[PDB]
Structures are given as structure tokens and as C-alpha cells.
Subunit: 116 residues, 4 copies
Amino acid sequence: CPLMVKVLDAVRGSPAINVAMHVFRKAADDTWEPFASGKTSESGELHGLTTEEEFVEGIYKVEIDTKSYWKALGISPFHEHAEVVFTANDSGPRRYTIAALLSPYSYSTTAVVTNP
Amino acid sequence: CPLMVKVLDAVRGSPAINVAMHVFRKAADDTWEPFASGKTSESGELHGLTTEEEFVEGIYKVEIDTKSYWKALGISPFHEHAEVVFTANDSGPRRYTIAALLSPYSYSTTAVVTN
Amino acid sequence: CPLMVKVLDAVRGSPAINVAMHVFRKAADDTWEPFASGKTSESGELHGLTTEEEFVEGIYKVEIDTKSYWKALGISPFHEHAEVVFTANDSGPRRYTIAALLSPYSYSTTAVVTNP
Amino acid sequence: CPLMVKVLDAVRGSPAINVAMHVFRKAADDTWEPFASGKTSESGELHGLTTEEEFVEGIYKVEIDTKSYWKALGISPFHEHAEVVFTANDSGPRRYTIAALLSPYSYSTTAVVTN
Ligand SMILES: Cc1cc(OCC(=O)O)cc(C)c1Cc1ccc(O)c(C(C)C)c1
Ligand SMILES: Cc1cc(OCC(=O)O)cc(C)c1Cc1ccc(O)c(C(C)C)c1
């Protein structure tokens, strides 16, 4: 469906497995409303967060719990989390893949936006 | 200078100049209280945000207005901003350089943490 | 199969399509021998470069023609190409995904190495 | 200083120190002729590789020995090295900073190209 997140580990060269993340939508009143959540699979992917009709226009935030991921590996990393904040579907529906690449003191994030 | 931010532009191969950003400290009630801000210099750098005495342990957020930067260049961006959230000084004062590399649909951020 | 390359465009937020690349293997005599080549698909992927039995231990180089990609979009980029040089299969066979993320003056590259 | 290389370590959040690298210029017969080398300082920087007069147009390669760096830290790396291949000075002399960010299974490289 319309929103997928793929998370890689740049130290081990592997998908980043069991990484928790929470998705929020900015409300009319400017607050962050809980939208969805899940944890990455063995392939570092999280699918099924939302549907085409629920995923309307708006500003979305994906908060990826990268600190817990590193802590479980014994590492105290720099970032509390990796955030990804973006306007979605403002020219009509699109399908978003959020790619995140994680190191203890660095994190990249990239979007692949395609038309269904 | 305990906190410095350096921003580069991966499309133009240059420092990212006049990029605004705000720094926040997480309050006891878990809200973000803004306490410093600035814009990058002609070398893409922002210095002088805080002092050693002020920069106590806590959770800090740097919100970099990448969307305005790309809009000023006439380039469509993906992100609303780039946010850098970290716990500072957890075993003593350190000097933090946040290095941010910007593309319209991608950014990376790195910390260089010294003495 | 054992070697896949996925190339993304960080300016347009899209797969980088029709990107040419050449794979070389370092020979016993230290020269770079042509190993395989291909161009990325509409999904920014190149598959079928090699087989499990051909892809023996050795030092491999993937030379991705990123300059031509940017030039065809009107852009004069920094890099002549993005190279990816690595020892493969030295603890037994593995499956390698090379992920490359391209901007006119920057390029990241990451490997996902998994056991079949 | 027409060419500077700055290398950071994404695992330790620090400059990458004592990283060796070699610089080559592509010859007329398409072989690479080595002409400069050095290792990064305690701030992860390598200066003084060439001079304005020597650094003429051509295709240059910087080969960064990331594998030795990771081996010295006891960390398994993926890449044999990180190579930065570019045409220099194509419309006049510029000042190039190559910024490299290193992880064991990933690296990124960026050019900051000025006047
Ligand atoms: C977008 C994407 C999807 C994907 O699906 C799974 C697979 O093909 O195995 C597999 C890969 C490797 C990518 C590309 C990707 C995925 C994550 C990632 O961090 C990066 C860096 C360039 C930031 C690239
Ligand atoms: C190129 C550079 C120059 C620099 O001078 C600032 C100082 O004097 O501390 C300080 C730093 C940290 C960098 C490195 C840098 C600066 C920004 C940046 O986005 C990147 C990414 C490639 C990771 C690296």
C-alpha cells in the first residue's frame, strides 16, 4: 500500500530488524495525532501502516526508535530517534517508501515517491 | 563553543547558506522549549548557539528549515525540515558538531563529538 | 541471485533508471578483468549479473556510470562514476545488495550482505 | 590549498584519524598515475596534497584506505577502499573539499566546490 519504511544497519550491513516506529499526522489544531505504528520485519521493512483512503493529504511524521535498536546491541548512540516529517499527497495520492540507513552517530533518510 | 552546526548542499556542491534553524530543550512535561536559533553563514556554519554553562545535560532538538532553503532555490523538497534529537552531555560536557548533508529528497546527519 | 544493485535519485526521490554499470573481478595477476554489466530497470534495479557458481571468492569492482545519468538530465555532476570495491564470499557464498543513492555532488553506497 | 579531504567516523562520532589515502591523475593512456598521498590529522583532515600551479585540469582519483582504518579499530569492513573520481577545474581553478563519512558497510562522499 501507500507507505512503507525500510531500515538498514550500516555497521553490520544488514536490515535493521525489530525497529519500532510511530507515525503521526498533524491535526487541524496543529497537534501531532497518533496515526499508526509497527516494528520492522526480518527484512528491515514495515508495511501495512495505512490504506489509500485513510492516507489523506496532510503533514506526517515517522519517528523511528533508533536509540532502542542500538541500545539492544550494546551501543549508546547519538540520536534519540530518526524523524521523517513530510507533506503527503498534496498533488493527489502517491506511494512513499521511507529508506533509513543507521549508524551509531549518523542517520540518512531518503524518500522514493511514485505514482500508483 | 559547545554546539556547532555545519550544513552542506549536495545539489550545488556548496555550503548551504542562510539555512534557518531552531534549537529546543525538552521540558519536564515533555514539551519542547525553544531556546536558541540562527541561520548558517556563507560557509554553511552556525556557531554561538549556547555557552558551556548554559548547555546542561538534557534532551535537545535542532530543527533545520530545509524546506525554506529548497524553496529559495526553486527546487521541490520532500521534507518539512530536518530534526536532530539527542541527549547532551550524558557523561560530561562535550563539543558537538552536527553535520548535515542536504538533498531535495534525502538528508543525512552526523555528530562529531569531542572532549 | 547473488549480486543486485539498487540505485536511487536523491534529487527527484525516485529510482535512478537506465543507469549503466560494469562489474570487474581482480585477476591473479592484479589486473581488473571484465566480469558483467547492465543498466538499471524502471525500478532502479539490476539483477542477473552473475550466478552462485560463477561468483567465486575475489575482489570485485562495480563502476556505476553516474555522470551519464546526470548529464542526460542536463546536469554536470562532480563524480565521474561511483565505484564500489569489495572482497566477496571469503567466508563462503553470500548474497550482496549494493544500494547507491545519487545527488549531483554526493553519493552514498551501502551493502546488505545476507546468508542464502 | 586547492584540495582538502575531511573524513568522519559514523560509528565513533569523531574525525577519522590516521586514514591513509593516495591521489592519482589519469594519464593519456588511461592508466592512473599516483602523484600525492597522506594521512588524516587528529581533526580528520588532509591538506597540502597539491598546489594551484600543479593542480591542472584532468581526471583525478582519491583512494581512501578505509579497510586499514576499520582493521585498526577491530571492526569488520565491507569495502576495500573508498574512491572519489572527478574531473577537476573544468571551467577554471576551484577549491575542492572532499567530505567522506565512513561506516563499516557504508560510505558517502560529497564535494564542496568553491571559487
Ligand atoms: C528502496 C529499497 C527497497 C528495498 O526493498 C527490498 C529488497 O529489494 O530486498 C531494498 C533496498 C536496498 C532499497 C534501497 C535502500 C533501502 C534502504 C536504504 O537505507 C538505502 C540507502 C541508500 C539510504 C537504500
Ligand atoms: C567539510 C567539513 C568542514 C568543516 O569545517 C567546520 C569546522 O571547522 O569545524 C567541518 C566538518 C564537520 C565538515 C564535514 C561535513 C560537514 C557537513 C556535512 O554534511 C558532512 C557530511 C558529508 C557528513 C561533512
